[PDB]
Ligand SMILES: NC(=O)C1=CN([C@@H]2O[C@H](COP(=O)(O)OP(=O)(O)OC[C@H]3O[C@@H](n4cnc5c(N)ncnc54)[C@H](OP(=O)(O)O)[C@@H]3O)[C@@H](O)[C@H]2O)C=CC1
């Protein structure tokens with residue numbers, strides 16, 4: 001029970017890249033993870049009432065397996081045609097600060113999850129709307145790729161914990 | 176024991192060490208606990224030799240703000256940069272060539288690869304790093320010198336909070 005929080009929760013290489021240069025997540029997919037442990041997906045997703053993601057993140061979701069989530073989803077895109085029948089969603093284009101009160105209203109008192117990518121998260125951080133960042137670092141470097149949070153920003157560390165092959169850490173907005 | 180080679184460095188949470196203005200500003204007013212988990216004091220006592228790039232050696236001499244009594248090797252093509260105040264052996268070339276000498280001078284303690292990311296990557300590429308230990312500061316930089324600029328795979332040992340920092344240690348697969 002809190003005011004609705006907006007949280008950016010993502011996996012990353014230990015050196016700060018999500019997606020590699022070849023546009024894939026193979027470095028992520030066969031790692032040990034414990035979805036019911038510390039910062040695990042099972043406890044996290046129960047707190048969440050709505051998803052928001054960019055166009056590439058949405059395309060990745062509709063093109064790999066069939067990740068099923070119960071919450072409504074918003075996609076930041078100039079391309080409505082991306083919509084797949086397997087993943088219905090609401091398109092929004094423009095300033096995320098205008099979208100944010102609708103996400104909070106659509107979340108049913110639960111939290112807003114910023115799925116990615118780093119450019120979408122930075123938009124929310126530049127509008128001052130991210131309350132928490134949760135990064136699960138995989139035990140590899142990539143050197144190059146999409147950056148986890150491509151800007152200058154300051155946070156307060158809450159804590160970190162190992163979860164399988166991952167280092168999971170949560171930071172909070174300074175007050 | 177077996178002499179290990181360890182890359183131990185601070186980084187922003189998003190993977191940059193030196194910022195775009197060539198400074199370590201965002202690092203210096205942060206709470207850390209030297210004798211805590213992965214803290215500097217417990218680390219340094221396991222170290223018998225240091226090795227670092229030219230730019231790191233220059234900042235250390237110019238900020239003159241840090242002490243050490245292990246012997247130090249500096250990877251530089253400008254052996255002119257040496258300061259009497261911070262003694263060191265110059266080496267240039269393939270670090271795989273230098274690494275037997277570091278290990279023999281380590282007196283059975285470990286070799287600390289200080290930085291930068293480029294120097295760490297040359298060791299990793301020659302399969303010479305046994306452990307990476309990164310202390311992540313609670314900030315992002317977006318750009319700057321990369322913590323480890325190459326593709327590599329590791330096994331996670333563990334992480335722990337130390338003051339403002341997330342510290343984590345990964346090991347070479349064996
Ligand atoms: N680790 C994970 O959970 C997963 C990661 N991947 C994702 O693949 C992504 C690719 O990276 P990145 O490029 O950062 O991708 P994003 O998913 O953030 O997509 C960015 C694109 O979204 C559109 N967009 C972003 N902001 C707005 C806006 N305010 N208004 C309208 N359109 C906007 C633009 O596309 P356009 O103009 O063409 O519409 C832009 O190119 C990774 O970042 C990662 O998140 C994939 C699956 C899972």
Ligand SMILES: NC(=O)C1=CN([C@@H]2O[C@H](COP(=O)(O)OP(=O)(O)OC[C@H]3O[C@@H](n4cnc5c(N)ncnc54)[C@H](OP(=O)(O)O)[C@@H]3O)[C@@H](O)[C@H]2O)C=CC1
Nearest residue numbers: 193228229230231234250251252253267268290291292294
């Ligand atoms: N650990 C930390 O958090 C600290 C970091 N620093 C900072 O780090 C920064 C330096 O980082 P970075 O720029 O990555 O540089 P490095 O310290 O790794 O130095 C890179 C330079 O060292 C030389 N070099 C590298 N490899 C070799 C080789 N095998 N043989 C011969 N010469 C070699 C080259 O210089 P050349 O050919 O000219 O000799 C190269 O340009 C400094 O700007 C400093 O501010 C400072 C204090 C603490």
Ligand code: NA
Nearest residue numbers: 102103105106
């Ligand atoms: Na609505």
